[PDB]
Amino acid sequence: MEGTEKKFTFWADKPGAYWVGEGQKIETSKATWVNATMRAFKLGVILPVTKEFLNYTYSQFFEEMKPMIAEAFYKKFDEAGILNQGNNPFGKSIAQSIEKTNKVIKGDFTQDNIIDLEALLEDDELEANAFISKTQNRSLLRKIVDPETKERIYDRNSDSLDGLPVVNLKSSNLKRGELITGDFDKLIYGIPQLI
Amino acid sequence: KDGTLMNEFTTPILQEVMENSKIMQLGKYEPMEGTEKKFTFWADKPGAYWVGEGQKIETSKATWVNATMRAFKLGVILPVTKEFLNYTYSQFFEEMKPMIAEAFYKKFDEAGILNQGNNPFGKSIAQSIEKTNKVIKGDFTQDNIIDLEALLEDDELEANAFISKTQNRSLLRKIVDPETKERIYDRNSDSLDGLPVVNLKSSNLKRGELITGDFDKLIYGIPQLIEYKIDETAQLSTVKNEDGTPVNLFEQDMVALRATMHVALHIADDKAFAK
Amino acid sequence: MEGTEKKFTFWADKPGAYWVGEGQKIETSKATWVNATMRAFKLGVILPVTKEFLNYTYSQFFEEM
Amino acid sequence: KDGTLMNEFTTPILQEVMENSKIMQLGKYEPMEGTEKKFTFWADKPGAYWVGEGQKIETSKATWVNATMRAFKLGVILPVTKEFLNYTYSQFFEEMKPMIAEAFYKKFDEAGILNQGNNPFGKSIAQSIEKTNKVIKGDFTQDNIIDLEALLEDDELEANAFISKTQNRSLLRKIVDPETKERIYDRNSDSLDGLPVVNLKSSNLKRGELITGDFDKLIYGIPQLIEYKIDETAQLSTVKNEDGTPVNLFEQDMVALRATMHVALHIADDKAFAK
C-alpha cells in the first residue's frame, strides 16, 4: 500500500430475546502516515568504489552487499518501532504504551510480578501470539531464581515467558524487562531501485 | 458526514464472534419447535444367577422459551440513506447481516451462563442458585480449587469443557501456589482441573470460574425479513428523531429464530460475596 | 457517481530568455452535495385509487397519473 | 498534501483559438540562420545633354531570434507527488505540452502586436505604429473605420483582416452602418470587410483593432525536450523548505523552439482617449 489502509468493521451482535432483534454497528478507519527512507553509506562506500571499478571480484561483492543491506533495512525499522522510539511513525509498541497506559515495568524484577502481568492482560482483553525480545534481554530472562516454575519450554525450540513460542531478533535494548507484541500492520514497496 | 461516504471500511473482530457460537455446545444440537423429551435411563443389575429384576425410569421435557431478534436503533437509520444512494454501502449491509447472525448466538449463550438475562428458567447460573451451590467466587484459594473437584465427584457429574470469559481467564492463568498440577497452557488452552476448553466473550466477573455439563441446543435459522417496519418504540439520533410517525424505509433486517435449552440436574457455578 | 465531481487544471507560461525551467501547475476541484427527493402521493391519489379497483376506466387513469 | 482525489483535468476548446490566430497571420519560414534584404530606390536625371545625378541605394537586413518555453515550478511541485500515485498525471503532462506550445505562439504575437513582451523588440507591429503615428484617438466609429481602412491602402499594402481582442469585437457588433446593412455581424464567421478576422487574448490590448497583411513568421521546429536534474527554484513544499533546486528528476520539462518574426510596418491600431 501507498499509505495506511482502513481497518475492518467490528459490528457487535447478540441474541438477547426470541422476538426482539437488535444489532450494534461499529466503524474503523486508519489515516495514512509515515514513509520509509533509505540512505547511502558514508566513508566505507567510498573505499569500495575504487575497488569495484578496478577489480571484477569487488564489483560482484557490492551486488551481494545490496541483498545484505536489504535485510538490514527491515531490521532497522523493526528495532526503532519496538525500542528507543527512533521511527517516523507515532504510537507504536513502546511509544503507544508510554502515551496511553503502562502494563509492565522493567525497573522492578520479580517472579510473582511476571504472573501478575498476565492477569492484567486478561482484564484488558488482548491476544498475543509472540513476544519480541532482544538477544541481551533473552539471556537475563532465561535464568531466574524462583520457588516454583511453570511454562518455560526452552529445550524444544525457544524459551517462553508466559506459555507461547516466540522468535528472538537482534535489537538495541536493555537487558532488564520484556516486551510483548499484539497486532501491527506491515507495508513494503521493494528493495534497491537506483544504482 | 451528513450522509456521505467516499470509501467503505472493513469490520473489526471476526474470529472472536465465530468462536462464541461454536463454544455453546454440551448436549447435542437438533432442530425443534420446542423442547424434545429426554432418553429413558432404565437401571440394570446382574444380582443373582436365578433371580431377574430390572429397574425402569422415564424422562420427558416440556416446551418452554423462544428466541427473539430485534432490529437496530439509531445506527441502522444512518446506514439506510447510504445503502439507497451508494452501491458499496448496500453490499456492506448484506455482509453485516452475517456478522449480526454470529452475534445472535453469542448473546443467547452469555445470558444463559451469566447475569440471567435469558427467557429460559434454570440454566447454568440460574439452575445452581435455585437448587444447590457448588463453587464460590467470593473466596479464592488453591486448595479450594482442588476441593471443588472432590465435591463434583460426590455429586457424580461429567464435564467436557468449562465456559469462561476473557476477563476471567486472565485472572485464572496467574495464581500463587506451592504446588501446581494440570494447567497445560502452552499447548492450546489453559486448564483448571485437567481438560481442554475454548474461551468465549461474555459479560462476567473476573473472580471465579464456571463449568458446563449438559445442555440442549435449538436453532431455526437466520435473517427472514428484509423490509423494516415504521419505528416508534426505538430511539433515533441520526438525521431525524422518530417517536410517532416514520417513513417506510428499510434500515435493519429482521431475523427469525427458535431456541430452547434443557434443564441440567447438576451444574457448577461461582457466585461472589462480600466479606 | 454519487453527487457531483469536477476537475480543472491550469498551466503557467514560461519565460522568453533561456536560463531556468519554470514549473508550478494549478489544480482545482469542484463538488456538489445533497440531492432533491421526489414527492410521494397523498390524499389526492388515494381517492382515485378506490375508484381504480372498482371501475375499469379509473384504473387506466392511475397508470397515466 | 495529496489528500482528496479530483480525477479531473482541463482540456481543449481554449488553446485551439490561440493556435488559429497565429496560423491566420501567414509568414514565410527559413531553416538557415540570418536574413537578407533587397536593394531599393535609385536616382534619375531629367536634364538634357548632361549625365546629372546617379546614385543607387543598397539595403541588407539580417534577422535572428531565439525562443524558449518556461518550465513550471509552483504547480509542478504539487504534481510530482501525484505522478507517482496516479497514472492520469502522466497523460495530463502530454496535454500540458500542447497548452505550452499554444502559449509559445501567443507570447510571440503579444510582444509584436500588443507590445507586452520583449521577444521581438525591434521588429514589433505596435512599436512601428507608434513611430508612424497612424492610430486614431477615442472610440472607433462605423464611418471612421472605413476611412481608416482606405487611408492604409493608399499609403501601404492593403490588409485582408483586422486583429480582434475578444472584447473589441463585441463593441463593434453593437454599432450599425449608415447603409442598409449589418455592421460586424457574424452569422457563421466574423469578418471586418471580407476575410475572416482572427481572435487573440492579450493583457496589454483591450480596445481597438489593428489591420496587418505582410508579416514574416519563422519557426525552428517542435518544442519537446526530456526532463533531467532540478533547476531554477521559486516555490517548493513537501517536507522541508529549500532555496535552491537540487536532488531527484525535474518536476517540469523545459521546451526549446526558436521563433523569429520580422515587421514590414502596416499596422495602425486604435486607442481610447481619457479625460
PDB file of N, CA, C and O in Angstrom, chain A residues 11-13 23-24, chain B residues 89-105 221-226 251-255:
ATOM      1  N   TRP A  11     -18.830  -4.519  14.326  1.00  0.00           N
ATOM      2  CA  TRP A  11     -20.267  -4.860  14.365  1.00  0.00           C
ATOM      3  C   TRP A  11     -20.646  -5.942  15.392  1.00  0.00           C
ATOM      4  O   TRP A  11     -20.630  -7.143  15.091  1.00  0.00           O
ATOM      5  N   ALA A  12     -20.982  -5.494  16.602  1.00  0.00           N
ATOM      6  CA  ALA A  12     -21.355  -6.383  17.707  1.00  0.00           C
ATOM      7  C   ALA A  12     -22.756  -6.963  17.526  1.00  0.00           C
ATOM      8  O   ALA A  12     -23.700  -6.239  17.188  1.00  0.00           O
ATOM      9  N   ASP A  13     -22.876  -8.271  17.754  1.00  0.00           N
ATOM     10  CA  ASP A  13     -24.141  -8.992  17.602  1.00  0.00           C
ATOM     11  C   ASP A  13     -24.441  -9.882  18.806  1.00  0.00           C
ATOM     12  O   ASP A  13     -23.566 -10.610  19.289  1.00  0.00           O
ATOM     13  N   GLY A  23     -29.052  -5.136  16.728  1.00  0.00           N
ATOM     14  CA  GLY A  23     -27.647  -5.337  16.373  1.00  0.00           C
ATOM     15  C   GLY A  23     -26.847  -4.049  16.371  1.00  0.00           C
ATOM     16  O   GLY A  23     -27.272  -3.047  15.786  1.00  0.00           O
ATOM     17  N   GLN A  24     -25.687  -4.086  17.027  1.00  0.00           N
ATOM     18  CA  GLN A  24     -24.785  -2.936  17.122  1.00  0.00           C
ATOM     19  C   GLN A  24     -23.852  -2.841  15.916  1.00  0.00           C
ATOM     20  O   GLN A  24     -23.433  -3.862  15.361  1.00  0.00           O
TER      21      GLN A  24
ATOM     22  N   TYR B  89     -22.343   0.552   0.126  1.00  0.00           N
ATOM     23  CA  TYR B  89     -22.983   0.517   1.445  1.00  0.00           C
ATOM     24  C   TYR B  89     -24.099  -0.526   1.527  1.00  0.00           C
ATOM     25  O   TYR B  89     -24.336  -1.102   2.593  1.00  0.00           O
ATOM     26  N   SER B  90     -24.777  -0.753   0.400  1.00  0.00           N
ATOM     27  CA  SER B  90     -25.833  -1.766   0.281  1.00  0.00           C
ATOM     28  C   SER B  90     -25.275  -3.191   0.364  1.00  0.00           C
ATOM     29  O   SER B  90     -25.909  -4.074   0.948  1.00  0.00           O
ATOM     30  N   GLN B  91     -24.095  -3.394  -0.224  1.00  0.00           N
ATOM     31  CA  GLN B  91     -23.371  -4.667  -0.152  1.00  0.00           C
ATOM     32  C   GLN B  91     -22.777  -4.906   1.237  1.00  0.00           C
ATOM     33  O   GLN B  91     -22.672  -6.053   1.682  1.00  0.00           O
ATOM     34  N   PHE B  92     -22.393  -3.817   1.906  1.00  0.00           N
ATOM     35  CA  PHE B  92     -21.864  -3.848   3.274  1.00  0.00           C
ATOM     36  C   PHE B  92     -22.934  -4.212   4.306  1.00  0.00           C
ATOM     37  O   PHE B  92     -22.630  -4.851   5.318  1.00  0.00           O
ATOM     38  N   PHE B  93     -24.175  -3.795   4.039  1.00  0.00           N
ATOM     39  CA  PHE B  93     -25.333  -4.111   4.883  1.00  0.00           C
ATOM     40  C   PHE B  93     -25.700  -5.596   4.835  1.00  0.00           C
ATOM     41  O   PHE B  93     -26.142  -6.160   5.840  1.00  0.00           O
ATOM     42  N   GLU B  94     -25.516  -6.211   3.664  1.00  0.00           N
ATOM     43  CA  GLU B  94     -25.719  -7.650   3.468  1.00  0.00           C
ATOM     44  C   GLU B  94     -24.651  -8.478   4.187  1.00  0.00           C
ATOM     45  O   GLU B  94     -24.941  -9.563   4.697  1.00  0.00           O
ATOM     46  N   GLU B  95     -23.424  -7.954   4.215  1.00  0.00           N
ATOM     47  CA  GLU B  95     -22.306  -8.560   4.944  1.00  0.00           C
ATOM     48  C   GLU B  95     -22.453  -8.399   6.459  1.00  0.00           C
ATOM     49  O   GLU B  95     -21.979  -9.243   7.225  1.00  0.00           O
ATOM     50  N   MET B  96     -23.109  -7.312   6.873  1.00  0.00           N
ATOM     51  CA  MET B  96     -23.388  -7.024   8.284  1.00  0.00           C
ATOM     52  C   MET B  96     -24.448  -7.951   8.885  1.00  0.00           C
ATOM     53  O   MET B  96     -24.462  -8.171  10.100  1.00  0.00           O
ATOM     54  N   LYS B  97     -25.327  -8.477   8.028  1.00  0.00           N
ATOM     55  CA  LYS B  97     -26.380  -9.423   8.420  1.00  0.00           C
ATOM     56  C   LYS B  97     -25.816 -10.754   8.926  1.00  0.00           C
ATOM     57  O   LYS B  97     -26.364 -11.344   9.859  1.00  0.00           O
ATOM     58  N   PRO B  98     -24.719 -11.224   8.301  1.00  0.00           N
ATOM     59  CA  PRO B  98     -23.919 -12.402   8.636  1.00  0.00           C
ATOM     60  C   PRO B  98     -23.132 -12.203   9.934  1.00  0.00           C
ATOM     61  O   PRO B  98     -22.951 -13.158  10.694  1.00  0.00           O
ATOM     62  N   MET B  99     -22.675 -10.971  10.170  1.00  0.00           N
ATOM     63  CA  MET B  99     -21.970 -10.593  11.399  1.00  0.00           C
ATOM     64  C   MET B  99     -22.919 -10.514  12.596  1.00  0.00           C
ATOM     65  O   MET B  99     -22.547 -10.887  13.713  1.00  0.00           O
ATOM     66  N   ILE B 100     -24.137 -10.027  12.348  1.00  0.00           N
ATOM     67  CA  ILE B 100     -25.196  -9.946  13.360  1.00  0.00           C
ATOM     68  C   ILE B 100     -25.757 -11.322  13.726  1.00  0.00           C
ATOM     69  O   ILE B 100     -26.215 -11.529  14.856  1.00  0.00           O
ATOM     70  N   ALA B 101     -25.719 -12.248  12.763  1.00  0.00           N
ATOM     71  CA  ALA B 101     -26.145 -13.638  12.957  1.00  0.00           C
ATOM     72  C   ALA B 101     -25.231 -14.395  13.926  1.00  0.00           C
ATOM     73  O   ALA B 101     -25.707 -15.214  14.717  1.00  0.00           O
ATOM     74  N   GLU B 102     -23.929 -14.110  13.853  1.00  0.00           N
ATOM     75  CA  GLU B 102     -22.932 -14.659  14.778  1.00  0.00           C
ATOM     76  C   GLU B 102     -23.067 -14.057  16.180  1.00  0.00           C
ATOM     77  O   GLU B 102     -22.809 -14.734  17.180  1.00  0.00           O
ATOM     78  N   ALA B 103     -23.473 -12.787  16.232  1.00  0.00           N
ATOM     79  CA  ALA B 103     -23.730 -12.070  17.486  1.00  0.00           C
ATOM     80  C   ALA B 103     -24.999 -12.555  18.194  1.00  0.00           C
ATOM     81  O   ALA B 103     -25.106 -12.445  19.420  1.00  0.00           O
ATOM     82  N   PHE B 104     -25.946 -13.082  17.414  1.00  0.00           N
ATOM     83  CA  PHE B 104     -27.206 -13.636  17.925  1.00  0.00           C
ATOM     84  C   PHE B 104     -26.997 -14.893  18.775  1.00  0.00           C
ATOM     85  O   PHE B 104     -27.668 -15.072  19.796  1.00  0.00           O
ATOM     86  N   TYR B 105     -26.070 -15.752  18.345  1.00  0.00           N
ATOM     87  CA  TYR B 105     -25.674 -16.944  19.101  1.00  0.00           C
ATOM     88  C   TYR B 105     -24.834 -16.594  20.330  1.00  0.00           C
ATOM     89  O   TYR B 105     -24.898 -17.290  21.349  1.00  0.00           O
ATOM     90  N   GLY B 221     -32.990 -20.737  12.203  1.00  0.00           N
ATOM     91  CA  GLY B 221     -32.311 -20.086  11.081  1.00  0.00           C
ATOM     92  C   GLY B 221     -31.919 -18.643  11.347  1.00  0.00           C
ATOM     93  O   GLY B 221     -32.034 -18.155  12.477  1.00  0.00           O
ATOM     94  N   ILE B 222     -31.454 -17.969  10.296  1.00  0.00           N
ATOM     95  CA  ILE B 222     -31.034 -16.567  10.365  1.00  0.00           C
ATOM     96  C   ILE B 222     -31.512 -15.775   9.150  1.00  0.00           C
ATOM     97  O   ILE B 222     -31.484 -16.280   8.023  1.00  0.00           O
ATOM     98  N   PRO B 223     -31.945 -14.522   9.385  1.00  0.00           N
ATOM     99  CA  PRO B 223     -32.499 -13.432   8.571  1.00  0.00           C
ATOM    100  C   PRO B 223     -33.594 -13.894   7.601  1.00  0.00           C
ATOM    101  O   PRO B 223     -33.303 -14.500   6.561  1.00  0.00           O
ATOM    102  N   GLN B 224     -34.844 -13.602   7.959  1.00  0.00           N
ATOM    103  CA  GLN B 224     -36.012 -13.983   7.159  1.00  0.00           C
ATOM    104  C   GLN B 224     -36.629 -12.794   6.420  1.00  0.00           C
ATOM    105  O   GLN B 224     -36.942 -12.897   5.229  1.00  0.00           O
ATOM    106  N   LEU B 225     -36.799 -11.677   7.130  1.00  0.00           N
ATOM    107  CA  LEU B 225     -37.393 -10.461   6.572  1.00  0.00           C
ATOM    108  C   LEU B 225     -36.340  -9.388   6.297  1.00  0.00           C
ATOM    109  O   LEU B 225     -35.471  -9.126   7.135  1.00  0.00           O
ATOM    110  N   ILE B 226     -36.433  -8.779   5.115  1.00  0.00           N
ATOM    111  CA  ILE B 226     -35.515  -7.721   4.685  1.00  0.00           C
ATOM    112  C   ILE B 226     -36.100  -6.321   4.889  1.00  0.00           C
ATOM    113  O   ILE B 226     -35.379  -5.398   5.280  1.00  0.00           O
ATOM    114  N   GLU B 251     -34.107  -0.217   7.240  1.00  0.00           N
ATOM    115  CA  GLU B 251     -32.915   0.189   7.992  1.00  0.00           C
ATOM    116  C   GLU B 251     -32.158  -1.011   8.565  1.00  0.00           C
ATOM    117  O   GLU B 251     -30.927  -1.062   8.492  1.00  0.00           O
ATOM    118  N   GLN B 252     -32.903  -1.962   9.133  1.00  0.00           N
ATOM    119  CA  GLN B 252     -32.341  -3.187   9.704  1.00  0.00           C
ATOM    120  C   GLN B 252     -33.232  -4.393   9.411  1.00  0.00           C
ATOM    121  O   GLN B 252     -34.450  -4.341   9.616  1.00  0.00           O
ATOM    122  N   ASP B 253     -32.609  -5.469   8.931  1.00  0.00           N
ATOM    123  CA  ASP B 253     -33.312  -6.705   8.577  1.00  0.00           C
ATOM    124  C   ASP B 253     -33.709  -7.511   9.813  1.00  0.00           C
ATOM    125  O   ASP B 253     -32.920  -7.651  10.754  1.00  0.00           O
ATOM    126  N   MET B 254     -34.935  -8.031   9.793  1.00  0.00           N
ATOM    127  CA  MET B 254     -35.477  -8.837  10.889  1.00  0.00           C
ATOM    128  C   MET B 254     -35.137 -10.316  10.720  1.00  0.00           C
ATOM    129  O   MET B 254     -35.264 -10.871   9.621  1.00  0.00           O
ATOM    130  N   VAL B 255     -34.708 -10.939  11.816  1.00  0.00           N
ATOM    131  CA  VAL B 255     -34.316 -12.350  11.831  1.00  0.00           C
ATOM    132  C   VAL B 255     -35.278 -13.206  12.653  1.00  0.00           C
ATOM    133  O   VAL B 255     -35.751 -12.780  13.713  1.00  0.00           O
TER     134      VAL B 255
END
